[PDB]
Amino acid sequence: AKKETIDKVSDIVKEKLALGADVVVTADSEFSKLGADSLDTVEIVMNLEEEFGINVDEDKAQDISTIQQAADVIEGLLEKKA
């Protein structure tokens, strides 16, 4: 993934965990540590899929733990295009 993609995802994720101004999310930050439960994570991929117009199964995003992890799955899909 790229530094640009991480910013996009983090923007959406942090927005779901907070307003974004009172929260601090990074590539090293874990969705579980940020305060995102199983009900939150599932929503993260949903908001992202609609953003990048991509699609991914939850069972496939299991390994996903940090922002970067979720960024790799997304950035990896957009590449499939063309």
Curated annotation (Swiss-Prot):
4'-phosphopantetheine is transferred from CoA to a specific serine of apo-ACP by acpS. This modification is essential for activity because fatty acids are bound in thioester linkage to the sulfhydryl of the prosthetic group. Carrier of the growing fatty acid chain in fatty acid biosynthesis. Keywords: Chloroplast, Fatty acid biosynthesis, Fatty acid metabolism, Lipid biosynthesis, Lipid metabolism, Phosphopantetheine, Phosphoprotein, Plastid, Transit peptide. One of its GO terms (molecular function) is acyl carrier activity. Belongs to the acyl carrier protein (ACP) family. Its main location: plastid. The keyword Transit peptide applies. Residues 3-78 form the Carrier domain. It is found in: Plastid, Chloroplast. This is Acyl carrier protein 1, chloroplastic.
